[PDB]
Write an enzyme that holds these catalytic residues in place. Structure first.
Site, PDB file in Angstrom:
ATOM      1  N   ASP A  25      37.150  35.786  33.182  1.00  0.00           N
ATOM      2  CA  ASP A  25      36.389  35.479  34.367  1.00  0.00           C
ATOM      3  C   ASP A  25      36.864  36.344  35.543  1.00  0.00           C
ATOM      4  OD1 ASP A  25      35.019  34.224  36.464  1.00  0.00           O
ATOM      5  OD2 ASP A  25      35.602  32.164  35.867  1.00  0.00           O
ATOM      6  N   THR A  26      36.173  37.468  35.776  1.00  0.00           N
ATOM      7  CA  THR A  26      36.599  38.368  36.846  1.00  0.00           C
ATOM      8  C   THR A  26      36.380  37.754  38.215  1.00  0.00           C
ATOM      9  OG1 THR A  26      34.533  39.581  36.709  1.00  0.00           O
ATOM     10  CG2 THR A  26      36.345  40.480  35.441  1.00  0.00           C
ATOM     11  N   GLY A  27      35.487  36.748  38.322  1.00  0.00           N
ATOM     12  CA  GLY A  27      35.255  36.075  39.597  1.00  0.00           C
ATOM     13  C   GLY A  27      36.249  34.954  39.907  1.00  0.00           C
TER      14      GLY A  27
HETATM   15  C1  LIG Z   1      32.905  29.501  34.342  1.00  0.00           C
HETATM   16  C2  LIG Z   1      32.886  29.229  35.858  1.00  0.00           C
HETATM   17  C3  LIG Z   1      34.118  28.740  36.615  1.00  0.00           C
HETATM   18  C4  LIG Z   1      31.695  29.816  36.606  1.00  0.00           C
HETATM   19  N1  LIG Z   1      31.646  30.245  38.008  1.00  0.00           N
HETATM   20  C5  LIG Z   1      32.065  31.648  38.199  1.00  0.00           C
HETATM   21  C6  LIG Z   1      33.542  31.877  38.637  1.00  0.00           C
HETATM   22  O1  LIG Z   1      33.766  33.276  38.447  1.00  0.00           O
HETATM   23  C7  LIG Z   1      33.779  31.455  40.081  1.00  0.00           C
HETATM   24  C8  LIG Z   1      33.145  32.363  41.150  1.00  0.00           C
HETATM   25  C9  LIG Z   1      33.482  31.749  42.477  1.00  0.00           C
HETATM   26  C10 LIG Z   1      34.496  32.303  43.253  1.00  0.00           C
HETATM   27  C11 LIG Z   1      34.845  31.716  44.506  1.00  0.00           C
HETATM   28  C12 LIG Z   1      34.153  30.592  45.022  1.00  0.00           C
HETATM   29  C13 LIG Z   1      33.086  30.142  44.293  1.00  0.00           C
HETATM   30  C14 LIG Z   1      32.739  30.704  43.022  1.00  0.00           C
HETATM   31  N2  LIG Z   1      35.226  31.481  40.284  1.00  0.00           N
HETATM   32  C15 LIG Z   1      35.961  30.364  40.345  1.00  0.00           C
HETATM   33  O2  LIG Z   1      35.555  29.193  40.249  1.00  0.00           O
HETATM   34  O3  LIG Z   1      37.329  30.672  40.516  1.00  0.00           O
HETATM   35  C16 LIG Z   1      38.255  29.566  40.605  1.00  0.00           C
HETATM   36  C17 LIG Z   1      38.569  29.058  39.199  1.00  0.00           C
HETATM   37  C18 LIG Z   1      39.934  29.648  38.849  1.00  0.00           C
HETATM   38  O4  LIG Z   1      40.160  30.580  39.940  1.00  0.00           O
HETATM   39  C19 LIG Z   1      39.600  30.130  41.151  1.00  0.00           C
HETATM   40  S1  LIG Z   1      30.601  29.611  39.050  1.00  0.00           S
HETATM   41  O5  LIG Z   1      30.750  30.178  40.376  1.00  0.00           O
HETATM   42  O6  LIG Z   1      30.716  28.193  38.925  1.00  0.00           O
HETATM   43  C20 LIG Z   1      29.039  30.057  38.517  1.00  0.00           C
HETATM   44  C21 LIG Z   1      28.377  29.338  37.512  1.00  0.00           C
HETATM   45  C22 LIG Z   1      27.097  29.676  37.035  1.00  0.00           C
HETATM   46  C23 LIG Z   1      26.481  30.852  37.551  1.00  0.00           C
HETATM   47  N3  LIG Z   1      25.285  31.286  37.067  1.00  0.00           N
HETATM   48  C24 LIG Z   1      27.134  31.599  38.560  1.00  0.00           C
HETATM   49  C25 LIG Z   1      28.390  31.187  39.005  1.00  0.00           C
END
Ligand SMILES: CC(C)CN(C[C@@H](O)[C@H](Cc1ccccc1)NC(=O)O[C@H]1CCOC1)S(=O)(=O)c1ccc(N)cc1
Lengths: 99, 99
Positions: A25-27
């Site tokens: 998960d790069t995000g």
């Molecule tokens: C598998 C998951 C967690 C999915 N998400 C992506 C992740 O990359 C998400 C991106 C993000 C970064 C900062 C604030 C808000 C969101 N990062 C995340 O939560 O980082 C946390 C968990 C550990 O480190 C910190 S999502 O945003 O829920 C999502 C879901 C569905 C779609 N279509 C698009 C986005």
């Protein structure tokens, strides 16, 4: 390996002696799993996700094996819908996003 | 290009006449952006993340340009605190993970 992204990029790692399927998960700044058994003490950490900020347990210096590399890393434990490995660990294994 | 992950991979995209900075997110199934007005019909969708479910509007065949490539793509619009492009768009531009 070079992984395309048509499917979710799930790999199996070893953490605290247990095999866990995790999404790369790069995000994600951090690595977080729901309800794994890790020994020792931890400290509270607040992380931000898409739905708001959530309190998790932070475990430091956890031995993990990922794609052949044995490292120690920080692992968060809390109510996540997906067990993910985030940039903290991806950086440790030299992962890149290419395009 | 090859991007290491010590930084968050933030790229600009052109969409709806605006320029937005988005996180290239292998953990997101689909792109989701917060502040944007897109034309036409859409379908309601719930996406799941840390902090629970988020209500979004799904817009299809939205023209965007990213990394120099013009494509039409699915865009979710809803109250994410961080704009991301997901695997749907990363695959359209041939992004891969490498480790
Ligand atoms: C598998 C998951 C967690 C999915 N998400 C992506 C992740 O990359 C998400 C991106 C993000 C970064 C900062 C604030 C808000 C969101 N990062 C995340 O939560 O980082 C946390 C968990 C550990 O480190 C910190 S999502 O945003 O829920 C999502 C879901 C569905 C779609 N279509 C698009 C986005």
């Amino acid at each position: 390996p070079q992984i395309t992204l048509w499917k979710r990029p799930i790999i199996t790692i070893k953490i605290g002696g247990q095999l866990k399927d995790v999404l790369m998960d790069t995000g994600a700044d951090d690595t977080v799993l729901e309800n794994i058994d890790l020994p020792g003490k931890w400290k509270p950490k607040l992380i931000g996700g898409i739905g708001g900020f959530v309190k998790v347990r932070q475990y430091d210096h956890v031995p993990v094996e990922v794609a052949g590399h044995k490292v120690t890393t920080t692992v968060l434990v809390g109510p996540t819908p997906v067990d993910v490995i985030g940039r903290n660990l991806l950086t440790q294994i030299g992962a890149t996003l290419n395009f």
